[PDB]
Design a protein around this ligand. Structure first.
Ligand code: CL
Ligand code: CL
Ligand code: NA
Lengths: 22, 303
């Protein structure tokens, strides 16, 4: 089953930003 | 751009619904990493629902707003472009590294920038573009002197106003500047786009020199690249620790993201805090982390 525009609720995964090396 | 009426929004929602349906094809293997079109278009739909609900009985007012007319025209144009991309790309849509798939990634980034802009101008669904607070004081003074309380200006007008304070050296430099600042790819400059650019390339006092050093001539700079594309691009340098590239963060607009290969064989990405990009790159070179921009043996000297 394919979801419609108004059925989807965002997952909102985040990419991994890590601490600076310096 | 035409007046926005309910009927125009309805048409735009139908086009977005077609894109969301195309992008649920399992052959695509779309990752959920920002920018993710299956998050962005539903979020854009919800924010437009919110705006429309706040302007119940004030639709003539909303439909005449200049920013909103430009935004809706561009959203319709970009969604039709995405539908056409699938139609013309056919089976090439399903090959990682095909040109049609790179185009879809770039469109995902544009949809992300468009949503961020819409939320910046219509926070809570009400138009607040005229009251938008520009982050860098010297940049704010420029915008208000040249454009007052305007939210959006055509690129040609922006180019003229900027050149009076910060001369642009050439036609080709102007086109590179447009490519950098016009994140929604609509031939207008919003106060939101202006805020992003002047945060990225601060200080204002040397704005275009900063941009020339960090983007125009720097081999490490990657325009319109996502987190996952940075990781993919650095893979070939996994045995060359110190290789690095950098780009606009997509989820923290106005901030930089630096990707780099460590001596342990990790490909990491970091957003510098409490130091400008110039200093992050200088310190990172001195300390052995940011040595080989896009894997090249020579690194620009930013000191
Ligand atoms: Cl301001
Ligand atoms: Cl500044
Ligand atoms: Na723009």
């Amino acid at each position: 089953h394919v979801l419609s525009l108004d059925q989807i609720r965002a997952i909102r995964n985040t990419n991994e930003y890590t601490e600076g090396p310096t | 751009p035409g007046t926005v009426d309910k009927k125009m929004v309805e048409k735009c929602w139908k086009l977005m619904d077609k894109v969301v349906r195309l992008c649920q094809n399992p052959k695509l293997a779309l990752k959920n990493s920002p920018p993710y079109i299956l998050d962005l278009l539903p979020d854009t739909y919800q924010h437009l629902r919110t705006i429309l609900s706040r302007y119940e009985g004030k639709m003539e007012t909303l439909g005449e707003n200049e920013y909103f007319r430009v935004f809706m025209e561009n959203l319709m144009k970009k969604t039709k472009q995405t539908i056409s991309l699938f139609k013309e790309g056919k089976e090439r849509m399903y090959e990682e590294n095909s040109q049609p798939r790179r185009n879809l990634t770039k469109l995902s980034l544009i949809f992300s920038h468009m949503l961020a802009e819409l939320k910046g101008i219509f926070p809570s669904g009400l138009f607040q573009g005229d009251t938008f607070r520009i982050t860098k004081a010297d940049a704010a003074e420029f915008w208000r002197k040249a454009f007052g309380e305007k939210t959006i200006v055509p690129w040609k007008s922006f180019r003229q106003a900027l050149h009076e304070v910060h001369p642009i050296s050439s036609g080709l430099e102007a086109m590179a500047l447009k490519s950098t600042i016009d994140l929604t790819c609509n031939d207008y400059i919003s106060v939101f786009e202006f805020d992003i650019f002047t945060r990225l390339f601060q200080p204002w006092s040397s704005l275009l020199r900063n941009w020339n050093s960090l983007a125009v001539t720097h081999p490490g700079y990657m325009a319109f690249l996502t987190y996952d594309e940075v990781k993919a691009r650095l893979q070939k340098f996994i045995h060359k620790p110190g290789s690095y590239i950098f780009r606009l963060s997509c989820t923290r607009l106005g901030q930089w993201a630096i990707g780099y290969v460590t001596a342990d064989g990790n490909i990491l990405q970091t957003i510098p805090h409490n130091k400008p990009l110039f200093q992050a790159l200088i310190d990172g070179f001195r300390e052995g982390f940011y040595l080989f921009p896009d894997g090249r043996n020579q690194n620009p000297d930013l000191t």
